[PDB]
Design an enzyme around this catalytic site. Structure first.
Site, PDB file in Angstrom:
ATOM      1  N   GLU A  38      -3.662  -5.388  -8.590  1.00  0.00           N
ATOM      2  CA  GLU A  38      -3.041  -4.102  -8.283  1.00  0.00           C
ATOM      3  C   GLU A  38      -3.439  -3.019  -9.281  1.00  0.00           C
ATOM      4  O   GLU A  38      -3.705  -1.898  -8.899  1.00  0.00           O
ATOM      5  CB  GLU A  38      -1.506  -4.222  -8.223  1.00  0.00           C
ATOM      6  CG  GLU A  38      -0.992  -4.971  -7.006  1.00  0.00           C
ATOM      7  CD  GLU A  38      -1.155  -4.250  -5.694  1.00  0.00           C
ATOM      8  OE1 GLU A  38      -1.661  -3.115  -5.685  1.00  0.00           O
ATOM      9  OE2 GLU A  38      -0.887  -4.882  -4.635  1.00  0.00           O
ATOM     10  N   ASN A  71      -1.947   7.170  -1.518  1.00  0.00           N
ATOM     11  CA  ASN A  71      -2.139   6.559  -0.202  1.00  0.00           C
ATOM     12  C   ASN A  71      -2.347   7.595   0.859  1.00  0.00           C
ATOM     13  O   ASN A  71      -2.022   8.760   0.679  1.00  0.00           O
ATOM     14  CB  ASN A  71      -0.895   5.758   0.125  1.00  0.00           C
ATOM     15  CG  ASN A  71      -0.678   4.637  -0.851  1.00  0.00           C
ATOM     16  OD1 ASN A  71      -1.567   3.840  -1.072  1.00  0.00           O
ATOM     17  ND2 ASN A  71       0.482   4.599  -1.476  1.00  0.00           N
ATOM     18  N   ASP A 101      -0.753   8.140   3.506  1.00  0.00           N
ATOM     19  CA  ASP A 101       0.481   8.708   4.051  1.00  0.00           C
ATOM     20  C   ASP A 101       1.104   9.751   3.124  1.00  0.00           C
ATOM     21  O   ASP A 101       2.135  10.330   3.456  1.00  0.00           O
ATOM     22  CB  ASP A 101       1.508   7.608   4.431  1.00  0.00           C
ATOM     23  CG  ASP A 101       2.053   6.834   3.244  1.00  0.00           C
ATOM     24  OD1 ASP A 101       1.665   7.088   2.093  1.00  0.00           O
ATOM     25  OD2 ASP A 101       2.870   5.928   3.485  1.00  0.00           O
ATOM     26  N   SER A 154       2.179   9.142   0.037  1.00  0.00           N
ATOM     27  CA  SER A 154       2.865   8.453  -1.027  1.00  0.00           C
ATOM     28  C   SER A 154       1.865   8.052  -2.119  1.00  0.00           C
ATOM     29  O   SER A 154       0.646   8.106  -1.924  1.00  0.00           O
ATOM     30  CB  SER A 154       3.594   7.238  -0.464  1.00  0.00           C
ATOM     31  OG  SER A 154       2.702   6.218  -0.097  1.00  0.00           O
ATOM     32  N   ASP A 171       1.308   5.018  -5.346  1.00  0.00           N
ATOM     33  CA  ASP A 171       1.684   3.754  -6.001  1.00  0.00           C
ATOM     34  C   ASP A 171       1.585   3.913  -7.521  1.00  0.00           C
ATOM     35  O   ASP A 171       0.620   4.501  -8.022  1.00  0.00           O
ATOM     36  CB  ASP A 171       0.721   2.662  -5.567  1.00  0.00           C
ATOM     37  CG  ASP A 171       0.832   2.295  -4.133  1.00  0.00           C
ATOM     38  OD1 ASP A 171       1.799   2.584  -3.484  1.00  0.00           O
ATOM     39  OD2 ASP A 171      -0.081   1.643  -3.655  1.00  0.00           O
ATOM     40  N   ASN A 198       5.512   1.774  -4.676  1.00  0.00           N
ATOM     41  CA  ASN A 198       5.294   2.924  -3.802  1.00  0.00           C
ATOM     42  C   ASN A 198       6.440   3.917  -3.757  1.00  0.00           C
ATOM     43  O   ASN A 198       7.604   3.542  -3.717  1.00  0.00           O
ATOM     44  CB  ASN A 198       4.983   2.368  -2.412  1.00  0.00           C
ATOM     45  CG  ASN A 198       4.628   3.409  -1.442  1.00  0.00           C
ATOM     46  OD1 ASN A 198       5.486   3.870  -0.658  1.00  0.00           O
ATOM     47  ND2 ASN A 198       3.389   3.786  -1.447  1.00  0.00           N
ATOM     48  N   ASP A 257      13.361  -8.275  -0.425  1.00  0.00           N
ATOM     49  CA  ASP A 257      13.547  -7.412   0.742  1.00  0.00           C
ATOM     50  C   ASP A 257      13.280  -8.098   2.073  1.00  0.00           C
ATOM     51  O   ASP A 257      13.583  -7.520   3.139  1.00  0.00           O
ATOM     52  CB  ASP A 257      12.663  -6.148   0.621  1.00  0.00           C
ATOM     53  CG  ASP A 257      13.143  -4.995   1.478  1.00  0.00           C
ATOM     54  OD1 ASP A 257      14.358  -4.732   1.498  1.00  0.00           O
ATOM     55  OD2 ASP A 257      12.297  -4.329   2.115  1.00  0.00           O
TER      56      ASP A 257
HETATM   57 MN   LIG Z   1      -0.274  -0.227  -2.572  1.00  0.00          MN
HETATM   58 MN   LIG Z   2      -2.600  -1.471  -4.359  1.00  0.00          MN
END
Ligand SMILES: [Mn+2]
Ligand SMILES: [Mn+2]
Ligand SMILES: [Cl-]
Length: 129
Positions: free
Chosen positions: A35, A46, A48, A50, A52, A59, A101
Site C-alpha cells: 500500500e 483516487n 472518485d 477521494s 488514500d 480512504n 466492517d
Molecule cells: Mn486504495
Molecule cells: Mn492503494
C-alpha cells in the site's frame, strides 16, 4: 517516517494487530508494504476524488475527513492528516474498524491482489518479536 520491515512488525504487534480478527501479523506487514512501501506520509488520489492516506492507505470517502471529499462519512472520526504521523496509533485504530466492517482484509485491494493466499509469514521472518 519510512519504517523498516521488522520495526513495523514490532509496532503493529505492540498495537494489537497480531491475529486481530484472525489476521496474522504478516498479513498486516504485507499490506503495508504494497500500500505505502512502509511510508507513513504516502498519499494517493483516487478517480472518485477521494484520497488514500498513510501506511495503510485509508480512504477519505468513508474513514477520515480531509475537507475535500464531499459526503465523507468520517467513520474513524479523525482528520486524514493524523494518519500520516510517524506514530501509527491512529492508523492502527482506524484499520481495526475497517477490518471489522464485514469484508475483512479484502478492503485493501493490494492485500487481496498481492498478499492473500501467499506465504505471509515471510514478512516477519528474522524479526525479534
Ligand atoms: Mn486504495
Ligand atoms: Mn492503494
Ligand atoms: Cl475475515
Amino acid at each position: 517516517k519510512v519504517f523498516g520491515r521488522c520495526e513495523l512488525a514490532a509496532a503493529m504487534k505492540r498495537h494489537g494487530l497480531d491475529n486481530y480478527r484472525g489476521y496474522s501479523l504478516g498479513n498486516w506487514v504485507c499490506a503495508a508494504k504494497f500500500e505505502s512501501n512502509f511510508n507513513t506520509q504516502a498519499t494517493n488520489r483516487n478517480t472518485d476524488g477521494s484520497t488514500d492516506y498513510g501506511i495503510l492507505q485509508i480512504n477519505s470517502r468513508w474513514w477520515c475527513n480531509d475537507g475535500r471529499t464531499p459526503g465523507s462519512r468520517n467513520l474513524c472520526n479523525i482528520p486524514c492528516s493524523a494518519l500520516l504521523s510517524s506514530d501509527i496509533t491512529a492508523s492502527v485504530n482506524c484499520a481495526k474498524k475497517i477490518v471489522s466492517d464485514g469484508n475483512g482484509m479484502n478492503a485493501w485491494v493490494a492485500w487481496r491482489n498481492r498478499c492473500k493466499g501467499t506465504d505471509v509469514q515471510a514478512w516477519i521472518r528474522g524479526c525479534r518479536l
